[PDB]
Amino acid sequence: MFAWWGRTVYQFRYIVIGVMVALCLGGGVYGISLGNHVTQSGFYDEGSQSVAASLIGDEVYGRDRTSHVVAILTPPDDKKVTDKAWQKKVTEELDQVVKDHEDQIVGWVGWLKAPDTTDPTVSAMKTQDLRHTFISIPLQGDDDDEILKNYQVVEPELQQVNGGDIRLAGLNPLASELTGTIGEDQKRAEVAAIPLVAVVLFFVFGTVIAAALPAIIGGLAIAGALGIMRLVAEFTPVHFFAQPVVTLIGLGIAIDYGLFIVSRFREEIAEGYDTEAAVRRTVMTSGRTVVFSAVIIVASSVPLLLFPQGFLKSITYAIIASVMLAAILSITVLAAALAILGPRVDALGVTTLLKIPFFSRRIIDWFAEKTQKTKTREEVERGFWGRLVNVVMKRPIAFAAPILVVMVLLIIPLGQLSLGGISEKYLPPDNAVRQSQEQFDKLFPGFRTEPLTLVMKREDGEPITDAQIADMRAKALTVSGFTDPDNDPEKMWKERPANDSGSKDPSVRVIQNGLENRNDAAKKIDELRALQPPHGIEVFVGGTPALEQDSIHSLFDKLPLMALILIVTTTVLMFLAFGSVVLPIKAALMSALTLGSTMGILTWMFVDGHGSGLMNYTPQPLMAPMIGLIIAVIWGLSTDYEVFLVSRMVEARERGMSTAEAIRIGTATTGRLITGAALILAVVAGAFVFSDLVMMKYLAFGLLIALLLDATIIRMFLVPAVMKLLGDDCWWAPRWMKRVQEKLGLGETELPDERKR
Questions:
Q1: How far is residue 338's CA from residue 214's CA, in Å, rounded to a whole number?
Q2: Which of 1, 76, 386, 695 could bond to 745 as cystine, CB 3.0-4.6 Å?
């Protein structure tokens, strides 16, 4: 299967480069505008009762646009908001903002529009000290994306009102910054991470062409991934987190996959193999490993398609596209470019600085060339990678328990993990928009309300009568734990306000009430849905707490099945990649341990708050949908690095080496290579840890911790110790499973020919 591809990619090499570079470039050009077709929603269980309630209330009572953007106005100098000179001017400027942008702004409403009024609620829109007033500017639009775009249109002009003495909070001021952090993260990843990646590539290869080829492959992979997701956005909505995940996860993986291909090609050239044989032996082993790693990533990502959150579906699509494209690219285009070049992949290297005499740097050139030279196989067995491997294998209990126990102690802090929703606390505490929102919540309390909503349908389209709502309210009073602002039971569970954008049909009635304590939300929601609906009436329990809690419940209910699918698919793929039954369980146990330790440290840093003052974020409950996301990502990459480490050991064992010899050779041959791959992906991740958005920081830190554990506490001295302890059982698998593997054309994990060279 892979030998045939190794033959044909070298033979048909000038008809691969063109087609599969032109396609990726065209995809990149088509998808540069991916950010113009992203959807901000997707965090909710769209099949749940809360989403149904939200839809029914919105289409019967109208979309509530009163909370879209609020603006706090402060008069200049000392004078109070009652200043008629100030009021006139701010009124006329608001009128200009509305008029000149009528396609984006329904209007503005507030105490400043009717300064001499009598409504207690309207008169509560100004502070007691007569220093601050606020207004609400509804925005024209049918969905959140259109409203956000309109807000972004009006932002520059809405910010010059009152000379600048205006602070914007609300849904869309928050959303604009929650979406601009994505662009800022991408900007840093493009301006800072790329040179560091290109430096690590040069230090792992020592040649500009050899180092550059994986970089070109990774760039092509991300361009094609953006193209594929832009195409996908024409059929189903895609979250705005697709394009960072492609850069954060897809790019590093794509670089690593091509790094392994180029390194193995140069390894076969150094042996003595001509370009054709070097390409074929590179495919049969390195390309097989890369394809297996990509399929493992895909199989560990597809469980996320089982969760209702469209955010997770979009991220899974992005990951699958990027990783499969990287796998295809590294073995088609990179393999045909290496076939075309051959010896020229080591042509323009450190020896170029030497020729130009511009004797310190003169000798430095030679030293840096000797460091990254064409090494030999016998010397890397007696290098650092191999001395460390042997000393660990000598005393393999003393390197396992002192690691196992501390990695369980790292899982210990996972018991305080709490789940939560998105808010302005997802931005750094010194952000202007967060500060404006907190200023609004401090000056004008009781206006930011998240009530639980009882949405009632009548089964026959007849109007709901007053007796039905009276019984529903009477029952809802039999649930303790809901806000009673005026100490009057008859004033609780008031009907939702009706806009002019609602059906107003008398068969649907929505009543709302806040709950005193947020932490009882679920208990109240599980108790509002326990009330007997009155005869005929269908009752739904929605609201922002309901949407959030249903989102958490949907992920808790479908998480064990995610774990089962993860374990079974990845262990079966490991068996087909290794030919052993013992190795897949050994690697799955370590992947589980690495995942547990990473999650424990993440709960330590982001929920418990240790490190929150240094990295400038706020300790808070984690975003519910992203728990499964980061579980899948960490599991996939941990399995990838296990495969990178263990494929060489399996190949050495199939050659005829003993267990210890196979462990030594496998770690030594891939030592600096896995080190460079981890360094590159860590550069990409660390470019994302300075994100303003807390969930991005959490995911990138999880990536970094998983990398460090897998490459420095798992690669060097846990896998060798456990394999030495297992012994000859490491390479065992029943004949009925070897028959299955060999029947598929993937049984070949041994490089048998040993010819020519």
A1: 11
A2: 1
